[PDB]
Design a protein around this ligand. Structure first.
Ligand SMILES: *[C@@H]1O[C@H](CO)[C@@H](O[C@@H]2O[C@H](CO)[C@@H](O[C@@H]3O[C@H](CO)[C@@H](O)[C@H](O)[C@@H]3O)[C@H](O)[C@H]2NC(C)=O)[C@H](O)[C@H]1NC(C)=O
Ligand SMILES: *[C@@H]1O[C@H](CO)[C@@H](O[C@@H]2O[C@H](CO)[C@@H](O[C@@H]3O[C@H](CO)[C@@H](O)[C@H](O)[C@@H]3O)[C@H](O)[C@H]2NC(C)=O)[C@H](O)[C@H]1NC(C)=O
Ligand SMILES: [Cu+2]
Ligand SMILES: [Cu+2]
Ligand SMILES: [Cu+2]
Ligand SMILES: [Cu+2]
Ligand code: NA
Length: 499
């Protein structure tokens, strides 16, 4: 069952074996992935998060981010530790109480403390639209049509060297999959469809690192949503999905009744499908209960290319149709050396006082804010352009901005910008050497918004900056509840920190 929009959510430790290997984890709702949190557009969500964690090897503190939800007027509820809150300590709870005006689509939630979400705290978050403009394109859209793609590690996250190339041990599709080494024939996930029906498959990358080449043997996929943004219909036979991205696609159950492989090939870790790694099963009602015998093609003839996507609505692009054609045009210098990432020469290390609390205490320019050199102020009611030229080791890096979606004016592997009708999204691959992926948005949401690579190991190694958007209006725009004001005293007391 789905839970929400008003619900408790318990965060616990437990042993799980999603690939046949047992390890302890950090779980929401007792499962991996966590339960789907759902509601309708414009609803009030009140997710009362109970931190019941006791195993220090995966951290006993926590904080949860609602990925892709703008949090306008509720920056305090966004979740990134030491940006918008101090962590929730064990034995305490915290009500994330916010609204989702003007958004409908496929989202997710995850820990936003250190690398904790890799240890299991990740789940889907769906905001349905009772008047969805895409409703007539499918018959079925429910918890059974959500498809999660996850990397899974046998080593606990707090034992992964910082700045290292860290590699997974299994791909999990809907929480199940087989290990790349010492492979055992553990259960594969089954997605069941009825011949002749059309399904809104909600594809969610809950990855900590790899991107996946996703396909379904014998089927194609008609994209209708990208990171919460409705798209024109685009039919593809493969989707390369980077960490934290989402797509909705229509699956037409129009092939013979039978069993078909669902494939998710990561860019690192196990290659291919030997022993049923990187796999799940599409089963038609009435098919024999047996593994598929289908083949992938050698090459995919209609892969997704990001510049082929266009919004369903006339969203346009803010600003002027040339590089630098914005009120506040930025170019970030994105680098890696010696185990640490940097942005504009500064490696991110979380501050002791959350950025939002520094601003509410009266710090009002970005040079007064800690960490020094990690906070960039943005002016209010202005067009922002951010160029993100690639080249730093460990790519391709999927960059994500909190508080906002953005027009993708220039995509990976294509030097041509689009100032007319690019897709809007919230997490974008910045590509390869010599690329100049560029985003634009307008500043109508006061508060400190994280910008970072969504490969969680990279964030931990410093690949982040904070956009302090409209510092002067942050306090009036974001009134804070007493329970939020209580978090930093409680946290600092528990950890013997003075501030
Ligand atoms: C990606 O696109 C951005 C624009 O969105 C390019 O930024 C431009 O970069 C050049 C330097 O590479 C800048 O010109 C330089 O400016 C300094 C003065 O600040 C001057 O001392 C240098 O002689 C040179 O003129 C320019 O200001 C900047 N912005 C623009 C053109 O709008 C960036 O180079 C592109 N990166 C890649 C890898 O393609
Ligand atoms: C590289 O990225 C550029 C920019 O996003 C892509 O260029 C765009 O290509 C589209 C598709 O061909 C062009 O739209 C077409 O316009 C024609 C002529 O008006 C119209 O008859 C078609 O109905 C269609 O809309 C679009 O104008 C063009 N934009 C720019 C700024 O060049 C390009 O396709 C990408 N390259 C690859 C290999 O995908
Ligand atoms: Cu996220
Ligand atoms: Cu986010
Ligand atoms: Cu990265
Ligand atoms: Cu983040
Ligand atoms: Na425009």
């Amino acid at each position: 069952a789905q839970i929400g929009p008003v619900t408790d959510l318990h965060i616990t430790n437990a042993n799980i074996s999603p690939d046949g290997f047992s390890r302890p984890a950090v779980l929401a709702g007792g499962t991996f992935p966590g339960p789907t949190i759902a509601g309708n557009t414009g609803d009030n969500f009140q997710i009362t998060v109970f931190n019941d964690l006791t195993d220090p090897s995966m951290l006993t503190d926590t904080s949860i981010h609602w990925h892709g939800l703008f949090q306008k007027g509720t920056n305090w509820a966004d979740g990134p530790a030491f940006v918008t809150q101090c962590p929730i300590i064990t034995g305490q709870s915290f009500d994330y109480n916010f609204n989702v005006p003007g958004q409908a689509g496929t989202f997710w939630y995850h820990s936003h403390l250190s690398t904790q979400y890799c240890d299991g705290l990740r789940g889907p978050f769906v905001v349905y639209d009772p008047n969805d403009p895409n409703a007539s394109l499918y018959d079925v859209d429910d918890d059974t049509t959500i498809i999660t793609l996850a990397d899974w590690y046998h080593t606990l996250a707090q034992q992964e060297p910082i700045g290292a190339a860290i590699t997974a041990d299994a791909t999990l599709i809907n929480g199940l999959g087989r290990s790349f080494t010492n492979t055992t024939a553990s259960p594969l996930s089954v997605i069941t469809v009825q011949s002749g029906k059309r399904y809104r498959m909600r594809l969610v990358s809950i990855s900590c690192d790899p991107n996946y080449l996703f396909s379904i043997d014998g089927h194609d996929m008609t994209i209708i949503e990208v990171d919460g943004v409705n798209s024109q219909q685009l039919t593809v036979d493969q989707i390369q999905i980077f960490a934290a991205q989402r797509y909705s696609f229509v699956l037409n159950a129009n092939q013979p009744v039978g069993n078909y492989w669902i494939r998710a090939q990561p860019n690192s870790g196990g290659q291919g499908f030997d022993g049923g790694i990187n796999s799940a099963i599409l089963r038609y009602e009435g098919a024999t209960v047996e593994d598929p015998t289908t083949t992938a093609p050698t090459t995919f003839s209609n892969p997704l290319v990001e510049t082929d996507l266009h919004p369903l609505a006339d969203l346009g692009v803010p600003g002027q149709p040339f590089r630098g054609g914005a009120d506040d045009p930025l170019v970030l210098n994105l680098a890696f050396a010696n185990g640490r990432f940097s942005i504009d020469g500064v490696s991110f290390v979380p501050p002791t006082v959350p950025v939002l609390l520094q601003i509410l205490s009266g710090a009002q320019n970005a040079q007064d804010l800690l960490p020094a050199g990690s906070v960039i102020s943005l002016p209010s009611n202005s067009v922002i352009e951010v160029a993100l030229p690639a080249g730093a080791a460990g790519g391709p890096h999927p960059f994500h901005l909190h508080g906002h979606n953005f027009a993708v004016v220039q995509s990976a592997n294509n030097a041509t910008p689009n100032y007319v009708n690019p897709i809007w999204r919230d997490t974008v691959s910045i590509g390869g050497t010599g690329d100049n992926v560029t985003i634009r948005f307008t500043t109508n949401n006061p508060g400190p918004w994280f910008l970072h690579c969504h490969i969680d190991w990279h964030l931990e190694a410093g690949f982040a900056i904070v956009f302090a958007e409209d510092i002067p209006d942050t306090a009036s725009a974001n009134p804070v509840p007493q329970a939020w004001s209580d978090l930093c005293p409680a946290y600092d007391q528990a950890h013997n920190i003075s501030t």
